[PDB]
Amino acid sequence: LYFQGMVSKGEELFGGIVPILVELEGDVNGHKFSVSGEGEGDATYGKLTLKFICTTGKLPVPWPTLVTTLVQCFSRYPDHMKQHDFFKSVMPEGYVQERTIFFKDDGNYKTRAEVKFEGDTLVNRIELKGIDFKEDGNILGHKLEYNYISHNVYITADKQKNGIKANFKARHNITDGSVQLADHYQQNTPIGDGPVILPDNHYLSTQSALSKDPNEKRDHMVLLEFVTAAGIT
């Protein structure tokens, strides 16, 4: 006699390949811009393939600084950790994701996003506000390398808000060989009134590879990303 255990509607929604849409509206130091993204996610392998387009012309900030803002519901949670996956638990109704990202010795981004299903498509709708940035700084001066971002996202339960918090330090290489710290603070809250999973402490090992489409004439970013939950034995 075998028991498979309960699987939530949210969990089951990610069993295969899911189309993804991303829509971002941003304003950094008065520079307004819009980004649209399309691709797909395969949570079985923690795999994301995405292409983003700046639909307003030239992106006024470096693409690498927008990666983390532009769907952690696609994380691969190992079987023994599936009881700690907040992101899928709240689906399809979704979660709000908010961040403040502090660029060391420069400005900050504040972001607000709604992540939920529209039909069979996982949608990430974002508003980004950046202030206190230096004109000739690493961000507005486009002094960051375009390559590869890899860090652990540290997650803790936020029982008071029936959600989670996260923190991590992204380190963007500067073109002179130095490094630009982007200190991330994150909150996720369910949109609906349904039951949620509140996880034990763990992290998401995340790797993003940035590239270009040789046939694309718009300002854009191609992304291959892998995200795996870890930290619990």
From Swiss-Prot:
Changing E225G: Suppresses the 399 nm excitation peak, leaving only the longer wavelength peak at 475 nm. Coiled coil: none annotated. Photocytes. Changing D106E: In mut1.27; shifts fluorescence lifetime from 3.03 to 2.85 ns. Pfam families: GFP (PF01353). Changing S178G: In GFPA; leads to enhanced fluorescence at 37 degrees Celsius. In Venus; leads to yellow fluorescence, improved maturation and reduced environmental sensitivity. Green fluorescent protein has been engineered to produce a vast number of variously colored mutants, fusion proteins, and biosensors. Further generation of mutants led to more stable proteins (at 37 degrees Celsius for example) with brighter fluorescence and longer fluorescence lifetimes. Changing I131V: In EBFP2.0; shifts the excitation and emission spectra to shorter wavelengths and increases quantum yields compared to BFP. It comes from the Eukaryota. Contains a chromophore consisting of modified amino acid residues. Maturation of the chromophore requires nothing other than molecular oxygen. Changing V227R: In Azurite; shifts the excitation and emission spectra to shorter wavelengths and increases quantum yields compared to BFP. Gene3D superfamilies: Green fluorescent protein (2.40.155.10). Changing K165Q: In R10-3; matures to the red-emitting state with excitation and emission maxima at 555 and 585 nm, respectively. GO terms for biological process: bioluminescence; generation of precursor metabolites and energy. Changing V153I: In Azurite; shifts the excitation and emission spectra to shorter wavelengths and increases quantum yields compared to BFP. Changing N201I: In mut2.1; shifts fluorescence lifetime from 3.03 to 2.50 ns. Changing K82R: In Topaz; shifts the major emission and exitation peak up to 20 nm. Changing T206I: Suppresses the 475 nm excitation peak, leaving only the shorter wavelength peak at 399 nm. In H9; increases fluorescence at 395 nm excitation. Changing A209V: In EBFP1.2; shifts the excitation and emission spectra to shorter wavelengths and increases quantum yields compared to BFP. Keywords: Chromophore, Luminescence, Photoprotein. Belongs to the GFP family. Energy-transfer acceptor. Its role is to transduce the blue chemiluminescence of the protein aequorin into green fluorescent light by energy transfer. Fluoresces in vivo upon receiving energy from the Ca(2+)-activated photoprotein aequorin. Monomer. This is Green fluorescent protein. It comes from Aequorea victoria.
